[PDB]
Amino acid sequence: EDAMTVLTPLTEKDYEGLKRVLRSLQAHKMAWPFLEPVDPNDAPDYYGVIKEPMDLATMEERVQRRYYEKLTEFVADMTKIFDNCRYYNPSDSPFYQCAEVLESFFVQKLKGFKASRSH
Numbered sequence: 001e002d003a004m005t006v007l008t009p010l011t012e013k014d015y016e017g018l019k020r021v022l023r024s025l026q027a028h029k030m031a032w033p034f035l036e037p038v039d040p041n042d043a044p045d046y047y048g049v050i051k052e053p054m055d056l057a058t059m060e061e062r063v064q065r066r067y068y069e070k071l072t073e074f075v076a077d078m079t080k081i082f083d084n085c086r087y088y089n090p091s092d093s094p095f096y097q098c099a100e101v102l103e104s105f106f107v108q109k110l111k112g113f114k115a116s117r118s119h
């Protein structure tokens with residue numbers, strides 16, 4: 001990551017952009033598996049295997065509470081959603097395919113956020 005992503009403290013202005021990115025993911029048709037935590041009853045060994053679960057509702061709470069100090073930390077939580085999904089599910093699973101498309105969408109939006117940070 002570039003040095004601004006790693007080092008520049010997030011401001012309130014930055015948080016308006018992070019909220020916009022999060023809302024765009026939550027509205028995407030293929031974000032349906034990631035809106036809320038994985039239900040253990042739908043995946044019985046999931047919480048024994050996935051040591052750091054993440055989901056978009058948890059990220060929404062963290063954004064509201066100003067949990068993130070650096071953009072890197074916000075990107076790391078987002079990336080957990082996708083990496084956990086691809087770690088647990090086979091490549092032909094609908095969940096895995098959602099992670100592939102939604103991560104590409106996140107990267108597009110993230111690049112937009114980084115470009116606008118200076119202006």
Ligand SMILES: CN(C)Cc1ccc(Nc2cnn(C)c(=O)c2Cl)cc1
Binds near residue numbers: 038042046
């Ligand atoms: C209440 N429920 C049915 C909604 C729901 C919430 C999350 C998900 N997402 C899941 C599920 N299982 N697994 C192995 C995953 O990796 C992912 Cl992302 C699906 C439905």
